[PDB]
Amino acid sequence: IDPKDLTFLKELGTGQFGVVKYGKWRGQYDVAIKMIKEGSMSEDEFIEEAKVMMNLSHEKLVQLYGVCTKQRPIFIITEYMANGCLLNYLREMRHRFQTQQLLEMCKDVCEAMEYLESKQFLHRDLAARNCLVNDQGVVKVSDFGLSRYVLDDEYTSSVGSKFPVRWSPPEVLMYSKFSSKSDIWAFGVLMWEIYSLGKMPYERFTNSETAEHIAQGLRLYRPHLASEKVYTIMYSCWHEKADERPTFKILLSNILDV
Amino acid sequence: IDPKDLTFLKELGTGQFGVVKYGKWRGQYDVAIKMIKEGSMSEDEFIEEAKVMMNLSHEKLVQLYGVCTKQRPIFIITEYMANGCLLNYLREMRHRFQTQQLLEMCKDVCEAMEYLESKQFLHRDLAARNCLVNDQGVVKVSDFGLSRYVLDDEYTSSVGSKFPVRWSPPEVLMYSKFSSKSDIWAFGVLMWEIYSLGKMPYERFTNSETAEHIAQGLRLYRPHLASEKVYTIMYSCWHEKADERPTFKILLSNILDV
């Protein structure tokens, strides 16, 4: 797909596969190049997923411009985000953050998650680490792709694994019950990450300890920067009964009038 | 611990935790700084494994210098390797090798592996992608960070996410039974990678067909740049019956004999 030759300057780092560099595609589009390894991925494996992900377009989703559908480290080309990942942004030196802009971030993410919701597309791993910020301060969700879809009512996929845990519903922390409502739980933790200015969820807990506590009733406390209403919103995402959880559509409305 | 008395440069090697970056340490030690991430993994956790890794040392093992687990993002500095990973090395400008350079590389890796074996430390992910090459052309094995210094000879794990199936023996393919002989198998495949000049194992297969292929007792074909003798040593690594697969000391003695 992507004409393998384009401008290239430095690199960025890593997300879910390998090294992501930087360059200019079509002499007008700034891009980040996601590299794999010619010993795992292939032009025949992701062709399906590539087309499907390109079906995902929204100003709040980091866009996949194209992929080098050939063989060797797959040179996938995405939207260059000048300010890096949200996690590093929140902790930014000069913490000049007002609740006004803090909420805007939750809004940018919610809009993106809202359209993914509508499009019936699960993110699987929603967290501030998987969100990028561009030169304008706009937060857009990325690291989606191998992120699941849905079918009759659920699935299984890779049996046995290590999930992020903190951003996961008690359902998944035990028998990996991923659903439309799984991303909802993680979105609340993300909101928490936002109002926490980068604070890692469940700090002072281990993964095994965090897992046991969520089931018993343990939840995230209100961050000093969040208002009572903002805490209500993020907390609606954590009902152990997935059915009682709101949609990104509702989550979007409530956020718009806080 | 390590006070950040480093500078900054550019892109570098990767690992399942992430990529690394360039800098100089305590005068003139070229280092590649890897991130473990923010909060996710805590200072206390890595401390043990850090002590354990720094106790490892062989000129054919990429050395860990220190840990910068200073609350915020945990960093690790390993020795910088100018030519990058062996996989990239095998395909790039250096492509024009000779059997002499191919066997030398297998020896470098077998020297580092024999050493790990004597220290009961297993490398659960040996592949060409995990080896790095310095400016002298020396090949060193890396990314054995998460690897386990298993006290007991039989090893059990947690497992999930995905598996580098193309370098795994059937008992790892079936229930993650890693041991010394699991590395031997993976090393044997690495040899096939060296000799086929950086080609991916079973590229027309899928992770599932590869498992079926191995289940039939079939392995990786003799590459045109390997003698019947060189093929005999790598082929031994894939015996199926774990106890019929040679030790790294024997493999190294085989390699030397020529």
Curated annotation (Swiss-Prot), chains A, B:
Protein name: Tyrosine-protein kinase BTK
Keywords: Acetylation, Adaptive immunity, Apoptosis, ATP-binding, Cell membrane, Cytoplasm, Disease variant, Dwarfism, Immunity, Innate immunity, Kinase, Lipid-binding, Membrane, Metal-binding, Nucleotide-binding, Nucleus, Phosphoprotein, SH2 domain, SH3 domain, Transcription, Transcription regulation, Transferase, Tyrosine-protein kinase, Zinc, Zinc-finger
Outcome when changing R129Q: In XLA; severe; disturbs ATP-binding
Residues with Phosphotyrosine modification: Y155, Y221
GO BP annotations, alphabetical order: adaptive immune response; apoptotic signaling pathway; B cell activation; B cell affinity maturation; B cell receptor signaling pathway; calcium-mediated signaling; cell maturation; cellular response to interleukin-7
PTM characteristics: Following B-cell receptor (BCR) engagement, translocates to the plasma membrane where it gets phosphorylated at Tyr-155 by LYN and SYK.
Domain note: The PH domain mediates the binding to inositol polyphosphate and phosphoinositides, leading to its targeting to the plasma membrane. It is extended in the BTK kinase family by a region designated the TH (Tec homology) domain, which consists of about 80 residues preceding the SH3 domain.
Result for mutant: E171K: In XLA; severe
Consequence of changing Y221E: Defective in mediating calcium response
Gene: BTK
Motif CAV1-binding, residue numbers: 185-192
Protein localization: Cytoplasm; Cell membrane; Nucleus; Membrane raft
Disease tied to this protein: X-linked agammaglobulinemia: Humoral immunodeficiency disease which results in developmental defects in the maturation pathway of B-cells. Affected boys have normal levels of pre-B-cells in their bone marrow but virtually no circulating mature B-lymphocytes. This results in a lack of immunoglobulins of all classes and leads to recurrent bacterial infections like otitis, conjunctivitis, dermatitis, sinusitis in the first few years of life, or even some patients present overwhelming sepsis or meningitis, resulting in death in a few hours.
